[PDB]
Amino acid sequence: EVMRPDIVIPTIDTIKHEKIFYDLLNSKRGIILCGPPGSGKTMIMNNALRNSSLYDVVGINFSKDTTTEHILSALHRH
Amino acid sequence: TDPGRIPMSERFTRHAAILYLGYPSGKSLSQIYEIYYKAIFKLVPEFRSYTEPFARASVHLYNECKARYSTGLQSHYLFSPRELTRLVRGVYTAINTGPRQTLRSLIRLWAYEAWRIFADRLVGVKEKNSFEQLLYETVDKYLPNQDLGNISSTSLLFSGLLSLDFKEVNKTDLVNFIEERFKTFCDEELEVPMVIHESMVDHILRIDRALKQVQGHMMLIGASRTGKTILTRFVAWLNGLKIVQPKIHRHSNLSDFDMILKKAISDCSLKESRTCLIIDESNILETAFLERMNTLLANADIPDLFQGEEYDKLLNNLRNKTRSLGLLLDTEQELYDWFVGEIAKNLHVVFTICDPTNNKSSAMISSPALFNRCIINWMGDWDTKTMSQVANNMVDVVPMEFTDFIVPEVNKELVFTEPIQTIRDAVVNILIHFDRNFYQKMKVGVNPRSPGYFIDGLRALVKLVTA
Amino acid sequence: TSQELIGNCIISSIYETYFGHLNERERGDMLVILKRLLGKFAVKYDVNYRFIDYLVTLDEKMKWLECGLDKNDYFLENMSIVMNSQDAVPFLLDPSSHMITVISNYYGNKTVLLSFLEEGFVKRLENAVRFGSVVIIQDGEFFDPIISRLISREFNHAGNRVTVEIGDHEVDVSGDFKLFIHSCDPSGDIPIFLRSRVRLVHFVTNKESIETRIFDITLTEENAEMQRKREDLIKLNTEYRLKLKNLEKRLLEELNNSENDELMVTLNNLKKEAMNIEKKLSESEEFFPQFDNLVEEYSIIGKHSV
Amino acid sequence: VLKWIPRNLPSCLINVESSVTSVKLHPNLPIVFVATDHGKLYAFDLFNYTIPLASLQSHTKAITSMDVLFTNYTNYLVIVTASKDLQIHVFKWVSEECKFQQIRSLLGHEHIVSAVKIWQKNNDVHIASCSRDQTVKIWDFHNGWSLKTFQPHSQWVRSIDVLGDYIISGSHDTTLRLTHWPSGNGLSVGTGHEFPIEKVKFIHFIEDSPEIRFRTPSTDRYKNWGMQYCVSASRDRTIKIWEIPLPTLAPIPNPTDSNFRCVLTLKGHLSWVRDISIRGQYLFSCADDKSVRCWDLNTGQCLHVWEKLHTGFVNCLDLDVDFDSNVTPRQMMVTGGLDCKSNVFMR
Amino acid sequence: VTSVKLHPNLPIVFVATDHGKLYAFDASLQSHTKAITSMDVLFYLVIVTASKDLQIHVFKWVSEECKFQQIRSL
Numbered sequence A: 001e002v003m004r005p006d007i008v009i010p011t012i013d014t015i016k017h018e019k020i021f022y023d024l025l026n027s028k029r030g031i032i033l034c035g036p037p038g039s040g041k042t043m044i045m046n047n048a049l050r051n052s053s054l055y056d057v058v059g060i061n062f063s064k065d066t067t068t069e070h071i072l073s074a075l076h077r078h
Numbered sequence B: 001t002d003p004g005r006i007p008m009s010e011r012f013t014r015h016a017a018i019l020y021l022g023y024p025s026g027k028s029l030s031q032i033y034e035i036y037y038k039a040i041f042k043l044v045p046e047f048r049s050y051t052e053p054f055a056r057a058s059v060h061l062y063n064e065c066k067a068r069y070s071t072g073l074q075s076h077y078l079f080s081p082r083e084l085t086r087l088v089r090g091v092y093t094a095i096n097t098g099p100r101q102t103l104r105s106l107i108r109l110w111a112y113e114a115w116r117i118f119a120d121r122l123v124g125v126k127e128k129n130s131f132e133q134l135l136y137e138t139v140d141k142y143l144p145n146q147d148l149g150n151i152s153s154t155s156l157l158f159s160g161l162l163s164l165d166f167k168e169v170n171k172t173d174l175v176n177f178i179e180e181r182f183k184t185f186c187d188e189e190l191e192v193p194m195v196i197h198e199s200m201v202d203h204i205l206r207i208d209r210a211l212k213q214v215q216g217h218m219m220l221i222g223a224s225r226t227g228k229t230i231l232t233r234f235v236a237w238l239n240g241l242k243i244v245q246p247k248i249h250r251h252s253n254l255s256d257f258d259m260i261l262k263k264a265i266s267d268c269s270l271k272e273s274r275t276c277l278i279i280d281e282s283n284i285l286e287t288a289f290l291e292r293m294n295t296l297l298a299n300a301d302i303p304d305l306f307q308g309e310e311y312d313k314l315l316n317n318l319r320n321k322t323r324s325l326g327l328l329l330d331t332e333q334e335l336y337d338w339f340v341g342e343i344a345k346n347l348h349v350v351f352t353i354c355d356p357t358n359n360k361s362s363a364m365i366s367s368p369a370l371f372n373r374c375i376i377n378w379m380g381d382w383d384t385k386t387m388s389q390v391a392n393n394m395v396d397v398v399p400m401e402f403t404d405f406i407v408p409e410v411n412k413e414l415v416f417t418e419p420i421q422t423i424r425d426a427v428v429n430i431l432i433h434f435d436r437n438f439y440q441k442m443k444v445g446v447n448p449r450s451p452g453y454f455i456d457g458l459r460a461l462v463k464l465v466t467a
Numbered sequence C: 001t002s003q004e005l006i007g008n009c010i011i012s013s014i015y016e017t018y019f020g021h022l023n024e025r026e027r028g029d030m031l032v033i034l035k036r037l038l039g040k041f042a043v044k045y046d047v048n049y050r051f052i053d054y055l056v057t058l059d060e061k062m063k064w065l066e067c068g069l070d071k072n073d074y075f076l077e078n079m080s081i082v083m084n085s086q087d088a089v090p091f092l093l094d095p096s097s098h099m100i101t102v103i104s105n106y107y108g109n110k111t112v113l114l115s116f117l118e119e120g121f122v123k124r125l126e127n128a129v130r131f132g133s134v135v136i137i138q139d140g141e142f143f144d145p146i147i148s149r150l151i152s153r154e155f156n157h158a159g160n161r162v163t164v165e166i167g168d169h170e171v172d173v174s175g176d177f178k179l180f181i182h183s184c185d186p187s188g189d190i191p192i193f194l195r196s197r198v199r200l201v202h203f204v205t206n207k208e209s210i211e212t213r214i215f216d217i218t219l220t221e222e223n224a225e226m227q228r229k230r231e232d233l234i235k236l237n238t239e240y241r242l243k244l245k246n247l248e249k250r251l252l253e254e255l256n257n258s259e260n261d262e263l264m265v266t267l268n269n270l271k272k273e274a275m276n277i278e279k280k281l282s283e284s285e286e287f288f289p290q291f292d293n294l295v296e297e298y299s300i301i302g303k304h305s306v
Numbered sequence D: 001v002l003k004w005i006p007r008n009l010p011s012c013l014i015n016v017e018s019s020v021t022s023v024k025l026h027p028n029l030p031i032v033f034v035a036t037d038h039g040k041l042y043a044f045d046l047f048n049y050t051i052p053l054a055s056l057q058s059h060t061k062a063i064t065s066m067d068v069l070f071t072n073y074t075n076y077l078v079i080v081t082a083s084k085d086l087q088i089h090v091f092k093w094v095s096e097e098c099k100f101q102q103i104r105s106l107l108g109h110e111h112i113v114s115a116v117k118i119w120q121k122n123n124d125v126h127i128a129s130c131s132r133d134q135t136v137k138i139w140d141f142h143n144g145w146s147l148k149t150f151q152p153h154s155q156w157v158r159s160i161d162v163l164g165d166y167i168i169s170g171s172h173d174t175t176l177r178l179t180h181w182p183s184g185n186g187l188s189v190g191t192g193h194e195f196p197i198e199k200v201k202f203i204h205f206i207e208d209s210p211e212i213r214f215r216t217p218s219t220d221r222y223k224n225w226g227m228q229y230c231v232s233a234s235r236d237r238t239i240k241i242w243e244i245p246l247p248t249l250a251p252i253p254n255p256t257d258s259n260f261r262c263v264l265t266l267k268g269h270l271s272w273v274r275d276i277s278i279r280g281q282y283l284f285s286c287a288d289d290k291s292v293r294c295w296d297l298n299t300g301q302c303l304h305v306w307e308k309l310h311t312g313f314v315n316c317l318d319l320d321v322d323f324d325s326n327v328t329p330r331q332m333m334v335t336g337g338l339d340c341k342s343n344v345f346m347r
Numbered sequence E: 001v002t003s004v005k006l007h008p009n010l011p012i013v014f015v016a017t018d019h020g021k022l023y024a025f026d027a028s029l030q031s032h033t034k035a036i037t038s039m040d041v042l043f044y045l046v047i048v049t050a051s052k053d054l055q056i057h058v059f060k061w062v063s064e065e066c067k068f069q070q071i072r073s074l
């Protein structure tokens, strides 16, 4: 199972962070995750999204040559 | 703070809350990698009790490597827990395809994986000496086991070529096998007079290790004429991969790059044949090619490559291939993510970088979609033992000992070759000393030194002394 | 002359590769430290070593002299570096673009001029390498990666014929073919892939070449008879050595079996040639210190001029 | 008497100055012919292995494959040595003089040739060879010229086998394909290996045996066609036995049955398998792990392993022909070696 | 011929002439300028040649390349 990148290991920090992301996402407020590149922001955010039954996942990865067309097309998918 | 990240205005962060996700502490990393090593050691239950020392050793070694080698020394010393995760995955894929394991063999396997995931990016020789001292300290602190041999990179040669399983192999047997297989490779492919030495054996082993993993990509950093792409072609011929070579001249644009990428992707998916993509430094003219590599590597494919009629014919070809293999896939999402799984499983990209101090090379190695998802291999310059071995192997053909040569009593550090007995060792030492003095006196600084001058001088020397 | 072969031959192999792209002062200093390194490791070498007198014989020296090359020693050494690179393709860096005519005179009508800025470059290049004509390329600062297999010489020996792939298909090559690259701008950036695989030779003119050229002009003008005498003695010494070698071969072929007047005449001619050689050596022994006095005399003008 | 297994130790060692490439057997006298990488063709005698009978240098380049056959007219011996000098050579053995007698050299290949075969069907001897020219070539031994040249594959074929009027050809593009001999039409194509095919040969008929699972025909179509089962050896460390399908009997390919079928796969070699030679119930094969293995057809497991037979790569094996009544299958088998040695097992 | 030698493994014979030239007939290299005295061969193959020129040169024979390459001289 360690080959699959979606596997998470629950500790106190990631469960406290999952609680805060649920609290802010239920508060209709934008959330900005800003940390060093090894902190696993994408992994913990997908962990909070996929295990839940109240939120969904869209795959958007920004780049230098990215406009609102990609965002709008990803919006039409769901 | 790092370059490539444009600071956004406060008007966008006005309406959004902000968080800082710091690095996990020692206890959290320790517990997470206890869980990882318990999962890995479930394969071999005889060493189940060693889960705590291995996780403690990995966490402490990562912390020491982060504290010692910083960003100030080199721009690519950005360590992360992702390297620890890659270490765990490498240990798993070595144990799973390995023989009956032993405690000494397990420690050697972990040491080899740490060598190939943690200190294959180091530059200075004293940095590698500090790393092997760190390995000695970590092993003697957390795994107090005797009867353990050398942990240096020459004595840790784990290969899958010589057997059916990932196991340690003898040095001379591996050297003979590489010699004969490279002779067969030169017979069956392009011919190049490459000499065999232990540093290239270690490099060819680590690039074979990197090119056998699922979604395995790496970037090779080293001076020119070090022999990078020939080693890449040698491994990709050993593993049955197909070489695709981007033939890009000066009168080239993004259309040729896109059509080569499209042909490679179509041959990877529809024809189900694995391919190796050697992206050279000179093959990236503008930043659009770097953006295309970012899209191809951070994700699994390029969504911008197939649009409209191209997208429709791609989906038609994917449906035809799925119906040919008799797989019940109907929705477009299943076909698309099966296709990107096929691309991520059957496409390996490698990079050859000549001068890392260039602005284009700095932008390449500072890219966020390249540094994290590729194994940084630093070939660097040639150390003195490699030069001595190459010169000894190249001057032995010609008769050279025909003069009354007396042994000169010189200093210990002034002799790089094993101590002088014949005129050949003196000639090799003279050549290496002149090369070092010449590269010192031209003020090369920290730029890599291309060893092609040494090989050209050796060839001219043997031809001229023959005449 | 045999106990120091490995010391003199290792200098010239060093001299070909490392010293292609240096000025006179740095080249002299590196030769000094090379002599120091050779003397340190107990490898003997000729104390009166001269690279032109080591590799460049008189015939090739004249043949280079009336093809357009100047009489400077630095240009002669660089030309010897260029025309003794059998394995590595040479690179020419001359701001004046003077020596295109030199290689055209040396290779005759076989010289075909090509440029990286052309549009039919690939077709005429593949036709020329199928023929085997010598090819000279201009605009070396605009290197095009389509000749990456020609620069690295990664030919595959497919059967009895040697094979290369250029561009997008298969072309055949011949043993007559030789490639040359010429560049105009000295400050033009060169790719590292091209730079590390060619013999980069600098045909430029620096302040040390100002000193050398002013020395050459003041010796060929102030005391021209001395330079004429030096050239005459060198030419007669070479001619007498060749004649003595030919006479020795003829004498050995005549007297290999078993006396007559033919052997006695050959012995008398050999005695006369040996006496002439001894007289020439005695004359030339006491002439170099005059040149030493001249070079100790005409250095203040060089310092003033620089 | 067909279930002989060679002993563990070599009977005697044959010393060669360079790398041994192809080894053959004389079907009447105990004489072995040993190739070299230097191109020299030897002829050792098993009783006295001190000096060769006739050391003839025929080519400036290496030689790759051989074939030997004692003809039966309605007689003498023919040795062919395919080489790397763009041509092949044909030799005749003289028993009275004990020296090689050259006959002719067949030309036509535009690259180096890697396979050669010689046989007879009805009072006419034919020679086949296959090269890096991607084309299968045929010759007439008495006439001297070719009959049919054709390319079956995009990449270059490596090894072949033949009986009657059917030719299969392993290729560098990891695909097998039967090529019909008169018509030149590909009856069936095969896939399933992951590496180029080193050696490949047919499995033929036998008269009487207790029980067979890999040589006996199943139906009357197999019985009168006579071509049922083939075994292929390829660089993916595996040996497989392949079912060949029926044609639309010039025979036509079957549109729904023009694909091969792998029946039994064998694995355990530590490097590339190089050559195979079936002998009754036992599939003798080599590898590049300094070893020669013995595989059974029925149980599909290696009964005997010969570990560290040489200090280097093992190149080629060859046996005596057993599916014909002209030549008895004597209990002799000899191997080659990259480390300049050749070993023969007897009794 | 001043000395005769034979290959102990393959059918090769080494012949040394009185003028110093050595021929390998189943190659022609002049190991010593003067007349050679005697030779010895031991199995890599090393051939030691001694002559009257106060210089003993040792040469090795490459079986695959059919050429002799000198290793060292006393």
Ligand SMILES: Nc1ncnc2c1ncn2[C@@H]1O[C@H](COP(=O)(O)OP(=O)(O)O)[C@@H](O)[C@H]1O
Pocket (backbone or CB within 6 Å): A007, A008, A009, A010, A011, A014, A036, A037, A038, A039, A040, A041, A042, A043, A044, B024, B032, B081, B082, B085
């Ligand atoms: N709490 C945790 N549980 C499991 N794995 C973790 C945890 N924290 C970090 N990791 C590891 O750290 C790595 C961070 O990778 P990634 O999510 O790509 O970083 P980022 O999100 O910054 O791009 C992952 O491979 C993950 O396995």
Ligand SMILES: Nc1ncnc2c1ncn2[C@@H]1O[C@H](COP(=O)(O)OP(=O)(O)O)[C@@H](O)[C@H]1O
Pocket (backbone or CB within 6 Å): B192, B193, B194, B195, B223, B224, B225, B226, B227, B228, B229, B230, B231, B352, B354, B390, B455, C152, C154, C193
């Ligand atoms: N001992 C050696 N080590 C490294 N390179 C060598 C050696 N001998 C020759 N070479 C040269 O190196 C070239 C291959 O290096 P390559 O990987 O192409 O360098 P780069 O990666 O800078 O393009 C060959 O063309 C060959 O001429």
Ligand SMILES: [Mg+2]
Pocket (backbone or CB within 6 Å): A036, A037, A038, A040, A041, A042
């Ligand atoms: Mg991140």
